[model samples]
Target: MGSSHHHHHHSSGLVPRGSHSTWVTRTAYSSPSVVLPSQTPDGKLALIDDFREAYYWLRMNSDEDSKVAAWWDYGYQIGGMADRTTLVDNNTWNNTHIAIVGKANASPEEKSYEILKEHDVDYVLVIFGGLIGFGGDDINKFLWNIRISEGIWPEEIKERDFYTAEGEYRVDARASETMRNSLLYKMSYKDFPQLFNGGQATDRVRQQMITPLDVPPLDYFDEVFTSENWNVRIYQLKKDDAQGRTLRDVGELTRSSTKTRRSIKRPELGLRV
Candidate 1:
């Protein structure tokens, strides 16, 4: 999901049509309605990719219409040829903003807007590569998110939270409770099984089986856009419900018979990855 030096620039226009042919599912912003921030004037977009070189394509796609902001990961900060000061953490404003995003709040949905208002981050960008067979995606580096954000989040995170009781690193029914409850998990698996016709979905990169039901509904971010190949996913922060409702209330109200079937998959303990 990250590279050190800037790479060759390929115009997103030349990315070929089939790139966007993969499965897309959303409660809102369904086909034909979804928009990209790159297409519209919005505040700075926060990227979680953690590589400055990889950002080249994002800018190419946006075509100078939007600004993409990169955060610093300590992993790439030392002895780097690139300007280290550009690291998000090096900027006080950016660092505080990310710290807040990593923390939990009462109105989880509103947290996105809260960070946006306070830190001027307009959107969150995520990369997923299963459909495209790209091994390096946000899902693969998700552990890094947990590890990096651990400093700000009140709760300490551990590998045990992501691994099974039997010591399996998995994204399926055997995933640990921490993995299942994670925001990253929800976003990555959002309607993930639909690609397989409601059957088991497998991660082509990991070659691991993932039960469709194991993926849960997202509460805070709304799917905005996905690249043709299902490689890139964009999410807009959700605002607070006008009725002062929480996610559970919204979930209960929006709960549908079809959704119920998909949510039935539960984590299986003591299973292999």
Candidate 2:
């Protein structure tokens, strides 16, 4: 991805449907890989991301190859299209459609990727705000993901999953299991403590504390790239293994290794010669 700092003006007319109305007179420092000719061709890549504003720029510059096949918040006068209520009831719609409708209703399916292939979508872009204090990042929008996918993940998705019994929303070790186990949790905290030297991982935006171990591992997605300030993280979807071993299974292998390979006493360094 190119790392350059430049400014451009934009308006809400170009923003995707269902997205908030806003205008940009001065664009933020952008570090997108699609800035080049070959990286983002017209209609060759289908992007799924919350940053539709940036996609508008990519689409305008790509000419033809960089067409966005499926996107969230699309608005048009379609007579036979499924109503918003019908779409929310079923979890089998295209991922792009889910994202578009979910923004308002807060319902996104867990296995939402199944429809990506059907929709000709190849790339999924996730914007993480914790690193650079970007409050509008996906992690903050996770509640919407949970709310929209609640029908499919009833037991697993709930406000209680993220908040405590006392209604406190925290990110530290004290955070609820649902919050810790979420994909957003794993991505946001992935190597985060390293930035803080094995200490507390802090979210500058929320002014919260996060414990390193509380962040779990992500199996279905592989991180491809991040922006200069670590605000934008792009992930490529991973296929299921032959043995059906999930990433969590790989993470569990070490804990169950063996008692024989463990040691309690520290080894002596110097010889008394």
Candidate 3:
């Protein structure tokens, strides 16, 4: 069954075309409904990709046209389904914008706040299926984001270094401290431990009791909506942060830090080669 028996039936686009042709997936996204193309990546059944209801809620809420910075997996789904802007989507590309989004999520939350501002992100969307026993959630696929962005920010992020001192992937108490502190981790665990005080919150898939005591509540993003099954979560970006006057408004903060240090050594805020 793995092989199609070398059949060449064009009954439907369901069958592969040109035997070894290189076709792209973006065609389906831009094509009019009057005619259509086929692709496997978007071939999931509606019930499984149940972010529709959450998107229904998004469509219902009032915002003329707010951009959502969501996981790339759901980029086209949101633009077509939610009918709004998404910073990264299912375009299935590994170019500039994708790297920026990946770096922010894999990095610290504070850095992400500034990064999002640089892109003018009105809201953020994260997939959190830990509550509903869903596998392949954002947390599960987080490492790939790390790996992808690490290639671009070689000095800033290290892939192998993400593992704990014991060297294993476990969401339980003995997991990596570096992993626990990521922006992705904070968003996924946000308010989860308190969702059930009696049971103390557990990742249904990982079967681990989530820790809440020392989370240090989120500073820049506010919890706006979570779907009925706690699968898809959304957060609205705050206009201001009391911590500092919202530095890096123009998105020049990332490389600016290191450059500033070098210039300080010269004491002129300008380095002349």
Candidate 4:
């Protein structure tokens, strides 16, 4: 979090899990509130979990090893204890499972729920980051949330809504209707202050003001959840309404729709590209 310390360990770099040439030699630029210490014992462990090579850095601080070497301090508790409750071994697991589940983006919720149920996973964990500056949380990675949620609710999540006419993919004021209304959108920016006042609300991340919604839903995750930087907001899927309507149905029934469709006229230059 601190400005990458201005010094580099020649052997250091942070890369995506599989690819090699896709990493960084030093710290990335970060803002004050959003930045955190990379050397946090847990931070170091999560890094090592993803890239074990980073673990050697721990050797450099042998005296502080007790303080820093506690494995629990390295990463999420479950991640560290994963092997204890294992089932299908990863080395023997089929990529087809990933591919099959991958296609779920357009499926309906019942089918998705059934498939997940078969896998013995009951509860799910989601991370939302509207309250803080961590862009890596589920809200920042909210596209995956849409894709995953849509996999089981095709008619619900529209990819088209995330973009604007000039084709800008903005999060602040210029965000298209769908993005602003999606559960992700509402959760991420529920009370984005009238910081911009009567004008459009600006996202700290994008630094652009976009129109604000008149009303937004409050975070209704259960007691075990958090809402910092909105870094964590979890909603247990409620059972169907006693009347049998889906949450999607309820949302569709209640959503406001007063905006006129944009006019489609031939442009002077007609540069469709």
TM-score of each: 0.24, 0.21, 0.22, 0.21
Model 3 lDDT tens row, 183-260 = 223223321221211111233311221221122222122211122112222111111222222222222122122322
Compose the digit string of candidate 2's lDDT tens values, residues 189-209.
221211111113233321222
Candidate 1 lDDT by residue in tens digits, 175-246: 323233232222333323222111122333221212111223232122211211122221111112221223
Alpha carbon lDDT at 266, candidate 1 = 33
Q: Model 4, range 116-144, lDDT digits (tens) per residue?
A: 11111111112222112233334221011
User: How does candidate 1 score on lDDT?
Assistant: 0.24
Any idea what lDDT model 4 has? Answer: 0.21
The parts of candidate 2 lying over 4 Å away from their true place are: 1-50, 57-59, 67-162, 165-220, 223-273
Q: Give the poorly placed runs of model 1, Cα more than 4 Å off.
A: 1-53, 56-66, 70-81, 86-100, 103-273
Clashes of each: 5, 13, 1, 15
Return the lDDT, model 2, position 10: 19
Q: Which candidate leads the pack in TM-score?
A: 1
Evaluated at residue 252, the lDDT of candidate 3 is: 15
For each candidate, the alpha-carbon lDDT, in order, equals 0.24, 0.23, 0.24, 0.21
How should the candidates be ordered by lDDT, best one leading?
3, 1, 2, 4
In candidate 3, how many Å is residue 266 off?
Answer: 62
Better of 1 and 4 by lDDT: 1
